[PDB]
Structures are given as structure tokens and as C-alpha cells.
């Protein structure tokens, strides 16, 4: 395709602005927050704390208007190169009518986070056409103890800072964990589980990748902030810390919306701490029941979700997915 507007690559010493569009994690998990900031500061970045850092409004950081103001102040700040959520929650979608999309279009930046921040990552892409990034949120991702935080950091640098020739191969992490330990304080080493991706349904697909957190997508679906899924797109979806009933609802939501009639392939993230409700079924097995007799190439257990470590994934750019050989390549520039 034609060259398009893109954000500048991250550079050492750049300022990362952090904001809390939903849960007040900088108040409720202060140790992991302080550790995450120090991790990135020690690497040589600067952190600009958004205006709701340290504030507390129970389930949220502040009112809808306060949270929009926090994010817009970073969007409008020409000294900020990367805007990163501290954590998700449920309520990022409340901000969407109030975000300064024109200011973002005037001065594009790296927009990164995951889970509930999907509402904003997809909303910005929908309104501006600028690719956004499914990737680290400050406290869950960079507050992680060694060793996994170093793998997450490596992928973050490789995708956002290093120059990359195209096609850009996304390598499989060698080890993973989803253990529900070591949140504020470390009590033992997480298991270094040997890692694999899964070839659920063979084949290849090339298309624009669209998606993120599927639970969160249901809170923006149908609105101006949800990019239209187009014939040939690759669907990227993940859920984390849910159960079989919840993800069957979300998979059937996609099915009855015709999404599976359009997409050329599906990338499914790992499912942290999945509750199979006694069925012993895997998330991809429930998805495949929803798919019925429709064959779609499908690569599962992709490391772009709440499990550690986390890949940084551009959204809104052409990708090739090979479910038979379990490869993912990015085919279009996502940064200058």
C-alpha cells in the first residue's frame, strides 16, 4: 500500500507518558508500580506520570472527564513519544467520546497497552488510521520480576526501537508462565515452562490484523470507535482470567456478527488462568465448536496477552500468519 502516517520509533531517553484509564493500580499496587517505573527508568527512559497517578476513586482512577483529561494531556504534549496505560480494568471505553483524536492525528505517538485498554487502542486506530500496539501495560508487564520482564522488554525494544527489515519475524518465546504469584512481592521463582504455539487448523493467511482483548471489544462493538472488520483481515483475539461460559459467549458474539465469514485467519492468545468449568476443554476447542463446519486457519497460544512474557504487536498493518508452521511476520511498516 501507499506510505501512510506513522509514529516515530522509540529512542533511548524518550519520555513515556503513563495514564490510568480505568483501575487505580498506582494507588492499590504501589510496590509493583514503583518497580515498573524503576525498571524503565533504569533502562534510560523518562516517565511522565499522568494527572491521576496516585489517585483513588474505588474501582477507577477518577471520573470519566478526569480520565479523558489525563490522557488528552499526554496526547497534546509534544515531548511525549509513547503513551502507555498503567493497567486496564473495565472502563476505558467511557473516555472515547472525549479523546482529542485531532491532536493525536496532528502528532502521532506510540499508543501501547492491553486488556481493557483495547477500547482506546482500537478507538484511536479507528478514528485516525494510525497503527496502535497491543503490548505492555506499565504495572502488569514491566512490574514483573526477573526473568520474564527481560523477555517482554526485549520484544518491546525489538518492535518499537530497533530498525526492522520487512518481513519482520515475530519469534516464539522459549519459556512462559501464568502463575498467580509475585504480584507486589516475590515469594519464589515462577516456573520456566517450555513454550509452544499451537497449530489448531492448518493453513496460511495474509491480511490486516485487527483485534485485541475480546471481552473488551464487546464494550465498543458497533460504535465509531470499533474499526470495521473487512474481508481478508486476520483476527487477533485474546482473553485472560475468564471461564468457558464467558468465552463461549464472546466467540458466538463474533459468529453471529459474521466476523468468521470475513476473516482469512485467526490468532488466539494464551488464556491466563483459564477456568474450564470442569470440562477440561481448551479455549480453542470451544471456539472450534462455535465455528462448526467452517474451516479457518488458526494459530493459538500466541504470547500477546496477560501471560508472561508478552510480545508487542502492531495493530492495523498487514501480517502473514502460517498456522501450519506456526509463524507470524509483519509485512508493513508500523513506525518511522
Amino acid at each position: 500500500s501507499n506510505a501512510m502516517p506513522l509514529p516515530k520509533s522509540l529512542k533511548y531517553g524518550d519520555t513515556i507518558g503513563i495514564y490510568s484509564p480505568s483501575s487505580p493500580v498506582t494507588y492499590t499496587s504501589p510496590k509493583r508500580f514503583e518497580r515498573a517505573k524503576s525498571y524503565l527508568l533504569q533502562k534510560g527512559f523518562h516517565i511522565l506520570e499522568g494527572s491521576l497517578t496516585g489517585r483513588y476513586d474505588y474501582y477507577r482512577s477518577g471520573s470519566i472527564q478526569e480520565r479523558a483529561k489525563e490522557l488528552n494531556a499526554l496526547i497534546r504534549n509534544p515531548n511525549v513519544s509513547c503513551i502507555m496505560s498503567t493497567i486496564g480494568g473495565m472502563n476505558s471505553n467511557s473516555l472515547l467520546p472525549y479523546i482529542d483524536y485531532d491532536a493525536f492525528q496532528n502528532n502521532p505517538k506510540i499508543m501501547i497497552g492491553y486488556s481493557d485498554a483495547t477500547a482506546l487502542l482500537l478507538g484511536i486506530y479507528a478514528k485516525t488510521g494510525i497503527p496502535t500496539f497491543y503490548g505492555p501495560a506499565l504495572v502488569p508487564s514491566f512490574g514483573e520480576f526477573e526473568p520474564f520482564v527481560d523477555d517482554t522488554y526485549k520484544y518491546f525494544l525489538e518492535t518499537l526501537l530497533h530498525d526492522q527489515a520487512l518481513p519482520y519475524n515475530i519469534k516464539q518465546p522459549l519459556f512462559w508462565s501464568d502463575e498467580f504469584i509475585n504480584w507486589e512481592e516475590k515469594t519464589k521463582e515462577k516456573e520456566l515452562r517450555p513454550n509452544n504455539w499451537i497449530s489448531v487448523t492448518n493453513g496460511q493467511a495474509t491480511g490486516r490484523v485487527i483485534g485485541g482483548n475480546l471481552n473488551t471489544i464487546q464494550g465498543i462493538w458497533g460504535s465509531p470507535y470499533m474499526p470495521c472488520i473487512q474481508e481478508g483481515d486476520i483476527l487477533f483475539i485474546e482473553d485472560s482470567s475468564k471461564d468457558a461460559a464467558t468465552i463461549e459467549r464472546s466467540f458466538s458474539f463474533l459468529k453471529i456478527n459474521g466476523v468468521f465469514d470475513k476473516v482469512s485467519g485467526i490468532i488466539l492468545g494464551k488464556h491466563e488462568q483459564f477456568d474450564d468449568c470442569g470440562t477440561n476443554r481448551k479455549p480453542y476447542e470451544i471456539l472450534l465448536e462455535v465455528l462448526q463446519n467452517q474451516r479457518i486457519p488458526l494459530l493459538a497460544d500466541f504470547d500477546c496477552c496477560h501471560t508472561h512474557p508478552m510480545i508487542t504487536m502492531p495493530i492495523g498493518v498487514q501480517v502473514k500468519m502460517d498456522a501450519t508452521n506456526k509463524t507470524i511476520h509483519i509485512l508493513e511498516k508500523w513506525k518511522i
Partner: peptide
């Protein structure tokens, strides 16, 4: 967590 958060 007791929550339904993402």
C-alpha cells in the same frame, strides 16, 4: 482476583 476486569 474477585473481579471481572480485563
Amino acid at each position: 482476583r474477585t473481579g471481572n476486569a480485563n
